[PDB]
Design a protein around this ligand. Structure first.
Ligand SMILES: [Mg+2]
Ligand SMILES: [Mg+2]
Ligand SMILES: [Mg+2]
Ligand SMILES: [Mg+2]
Ligand SMILES: [Mg+2]
Ligand SMILES: [Mg+2]
Ligand SMILES: [Mg+2]
Ligand SMILES: [Mg+2]
Ligand SMILES: [Mg+2]
Ligand SMILES: [Mg+2]
Ligand SMILES: [Mg+2]
Ligand SMILES: [Mg+2]
Ligand SMILES: [Mg+2]
Ligand SMILES: [Mg+2]
Ligand SMILES: [Mg+2]
Ligand SMILES: [Mg+2]
Ligand SMILES: [Mg+2]
Ligand SMILES: [Mg+2]
Ligand SMILES: [Mg+2]
Ligand SMILES: [Mg+2]
Ligand SMILES: [Mg+2]
Ligand SMILES: [Mg+2]
Ligand SMILES: [Mg+2]
Ligand SMILES: [Mg+2]
Ligand SMILES: [Mg+2]
Ligand SMILES: [Mg+2]
Ligand SMILES: [Mg+2]
Ligand SMILES: [Mg+2]
Ligand SMILES: [Mg+2]
Ligand SMILES: [Mg+2]
Lengths: 100, 357, 141
RNA sequence: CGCCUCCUAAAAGGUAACGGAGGCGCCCAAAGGUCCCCUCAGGCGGGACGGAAAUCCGCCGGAGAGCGCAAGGGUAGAAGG
RNA sequence: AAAUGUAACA
RNA sequence: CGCGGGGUGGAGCAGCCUGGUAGCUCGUCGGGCUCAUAACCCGAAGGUCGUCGGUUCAAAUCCGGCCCCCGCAACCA
């Protein structure tokens, strides 16, 4: 993942969903990596296997819809307060019998 | 049209020099610059910190007013330096000037309203009839209308919480939520008994009568009296009951006594047989008794207000609505508008702005 | 805090804590992880205390992944009743944790930060833990 | 407090506790017999009143519908219409 | 068979 | 903790048990009578049926869980 995402500069986190990608390729032809330019990602943008520039002779073996990288908001103490005073509704029990 | 707006920046700035007293604060500023000037003044720095923080407390007055008489005067010479040379950039560059000092003077006008703890909470207006009766209940309804049209012409929300209409004609009392921005600052200088001298319509032969009604104004608090019970301050004793039970009661420590340490409140329970039924119950009773003290505090502060809250009576007042010679006088600052049925429309800005000194 | 939003059954037998984890034994998201060394019921209280400890160490930044979740209702009878008269009331919920499970997992954070945060989080838990970082063994899973 | 379904019950059967959950004390003259014929729910598109859902058209569809009522088992190569 | 009208009459 | 009864406009109650339809009184609002107010007369408005879920084609109503309210019981040592 080449580049520093601009979301990272804004305080975000680069979540590396895939650190490798599945591929059909010749053994004589195995690349060492595949670069991906993530510097354009904000919070919260995402890259997909379709966005992969592939080198010659290598051929994507997952769905291009597969998400590979995303930039997510950070962990923040200013939120703790609301989460502590957040009240939870007690769990509902799924009805059985003449109650469905 | 632009030198009319310098004409006004010199108007709000002069009686701004009146309550601030440039004459009485250019004085005090100098022997604090003198005390703090000799090298022994960081000897008990408590003495020092109050004065160096005072010094800009007075240099946000003295020297800020010192950039208003020089600043405006270098504005009015640069805008004549743009008319007679046809230089329109000397007049955009002496207007970017009038937008900067229109804020240092706006900032110095928040010594009127930025001094009152919470002068921003959505306040409540508590209007009451008074001396006279029917006439004053009429005047009471007139005076709610007056503050309602006021609050609309000022961006507030006209939110009526509680009424009670009078039985002959009018209102005995009303409470409005003035839901708006900085609302308490404006309407706290409206607290008082409004006398209405007037000419009366309910008296048969048409006699001239006086009738009073009040306006009391307060802000909004947390209004939450649900203090949590924390085990750091409860001491719970356990011992035997005092009546029937048998080899039980004798031979079992079923009775509990919970005593809140800082308050001194004690409480027992012996009703049941388990000390945990009793520890349960005494926790309830102990909750409720500190819910009753924290109640007694709040009511105590309320009665302190009530007994310090005028009387809506003769010689207890702040205004004339002598509508038989068309005046409305605020005996407190005190101004004299002659356009009476324009005050009832909501021109209260007049009195308010001059009453915040 | 964490609990199922709804369920087919309110109460659940206690079961048992035999063996190593069924799954979730490898780092799957973040850069480092906190792995359980001994079995326990981890309450939702303990999970939340660990989480808050970690965000409160990161202060701002990073990303925490909680990979266990308390769906098992914990039950207890009212104080000083006798045995019998039905099963106790649901008082809280727990996540069943067995040796080898990656409970928490952090990313977007330096190595000393991750080490320290996961340590402090480990002190909030009723079991011995171990700090791990992502490996090729993890990647190969 | 008797009866039915599921779990606890440790892969035959059976198996307890004031263990965890629900039902029954009816009903149907067709909701029964036998011949013959037919196939669902749902999703997507189209379509006067007309809607999330009335009926209609088309395409996608092994059963997730239905089987009077709890649950389980079974079931369109019918037990369903 | 049916209530009431305060508070500043030269 | 137990048993069983309730929560429905601004207020107090009816409606449930044998499900589809929420009513009465006071109040509130507009109009009249009066010099004016009350009283009276004419017309009008007004309810997430405590919440979550859901029985059924369909719930204020039927059946569970929680939440406040009321009554009773809590004994033998
Ligand atoms: Mg005694
Ligand atoms: Mg003893
Ligand atoms: Mg004893
Ligand atoms: Mg007029
Ligand atoms: Mg057990
Ligand atoms: Mg298991
Ligand atoms: Mg435990
Ligand atoms: Mg337990
Ligand atoms: Mg006992
Ligand atoms: Mg038991
Ligand atoms: Mg229990
Ligand atoms: Mg617990
Ligand atoms: Mg586990
Ligand atoms: Mg530990
Ligand atoms: Mg796997
Ligand atoms: Mg068995
Ligand atoms: Mg079995
Ligand atoms: Mg068996
Ligand atoms: Mg066996
Ligand atoms: Mg046999
Ligand atoms: Mg039964
Ligand atoms: Mg037939
Ligand atoms: Mg036939
Ligand atoms: Mg269809
Ligand atoms: Mg359609
Ligand atoms: Mg249509
Ligand atoms: Mg249609
Ligand atoms: Mg079926
Ligand atoms: Mg049934
Ligand atoms: Mg006896």
């Amino acid at each position: 993942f080449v580049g520093t995402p601009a979301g990272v500069r804004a305080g975000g986190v680069l979540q590396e969903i895939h650190r490798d990608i599945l591929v059909k390729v010749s053994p004589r032809n195995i690349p060492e990596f595949i670069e991906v330019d993530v510097s354009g990602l904000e919070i919260g943008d995402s890259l997909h296997a379709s966005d992969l520039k592939l080198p010659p002779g290598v051929e994507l073996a997952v769905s291009p819809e597969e998400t590979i990288a995303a930039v997510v908001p950070p962990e923040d103490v200013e939120k703790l307060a609301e989460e502590a005073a957040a009240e939870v509704a007690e769990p509902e029990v799924i009805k059985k019998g003449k109650e469905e | 049209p632009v030198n009319n707006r310098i004409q006004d920046l010199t108007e709000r700035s002069d009686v701004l020099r009146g309550y601030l007293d440039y004459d009485a604060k250019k004085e005090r500023l100098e022997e604090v610059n003198a005390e703090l000037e000799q090298p022994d003044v960081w000897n008990e720095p408590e003495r020092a910190q109050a004065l160096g923080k005072e010094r800009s407390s007075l240099e946000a007055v003295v020297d800020t007013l010192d950039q208003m008489k020089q600043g405006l005067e270098d504005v009015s010479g640069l805008l004549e330096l743009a008319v007679e040379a046809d230089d329109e950039e000397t007049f955009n560059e002496a207007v970017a000037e009038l937008d900067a000092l229109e804020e240092k003077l706006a900032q110095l006008e928040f010594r009127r309203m930025f001094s009152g703890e919470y002068d921003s909470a959505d306040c409540y207006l508590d209007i009451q009839a008074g001396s006279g009766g029917t006439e004053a209940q009429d005047w009471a309804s007139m005076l709610e209308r007056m503050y309602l049209r006021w609050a609309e012409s000022r961006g507030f929300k006209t939110e009526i919480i509680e009424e009670s209409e009078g039985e002959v004609a009018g209102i005995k009392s009303v409470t409005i939520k003035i839901s708006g921005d900085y609302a308490y600052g404006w309407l706290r200088t409206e607290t008082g008994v409004h006398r209405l001298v007037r000419k009366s319509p309910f008296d048969s032969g048409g006699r001239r009568h006086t009738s009073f009604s009040s306006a009391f104004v307060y802000p909004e608090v947390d209004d939450d009296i649900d203090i949590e019970i924390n085990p750091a301050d409860l001491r719970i004793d356990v011992y035997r009951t005092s009546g029937a039970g048998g080899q039980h009661v004798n031979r079992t420590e079923s009775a509990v006594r919970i005593t809140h340490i800082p308050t001194g409140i004690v409480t027992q329970c012996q009703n049941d047989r388990s000390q945990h039924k009793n520890k349960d119950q005494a926790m309830k009773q102990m909750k409720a008794k500190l819910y009753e003290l924290e109640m007694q505090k709040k009511n105590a502060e309320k009665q302190a207000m009530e007994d310090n809250k005028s009387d809506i009576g003769w010689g207890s007042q702040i205004r004339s609505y002598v509508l038989d010679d068309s005046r409305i006088k605020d005996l407190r600052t005190g101004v004299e508008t002659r356009n009476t049925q324009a005050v009832l429309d909501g021109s209260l800005d007049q009195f308010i702005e001059a009453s915040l000194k | 805090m964490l609990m199922p939003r709804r369920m087919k059954y309110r109460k659940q037998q206690r079961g048992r804590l035999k063996g190593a984890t069924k799954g979730g034994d490898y780092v799957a998201f973040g850069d480092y992880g906190l792995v359980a060394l001994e079995p326990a019921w981890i309450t939702a209280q303990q999970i939340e205390a660990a989480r808050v400890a970690m965000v409160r160490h990161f202060r701002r930044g990073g990303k925490i992944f909680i990979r266990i979740f308390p769906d098992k209702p914990y039950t207890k009878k009212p104080l000083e009743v006798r045995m019998g008269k039905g099963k106790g009331n649901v008082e809280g919920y727990v996540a069943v944790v067995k040796p080898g499970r990656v409970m928490f997992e952090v990313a977007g954070v330096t190595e000393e930060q991750a080490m320290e945060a996961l340590r402090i989080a480990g002190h909030k838990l009723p079991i011995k833990t171990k700090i791990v970082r992502r490996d090729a063994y993890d990647e190969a899973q």
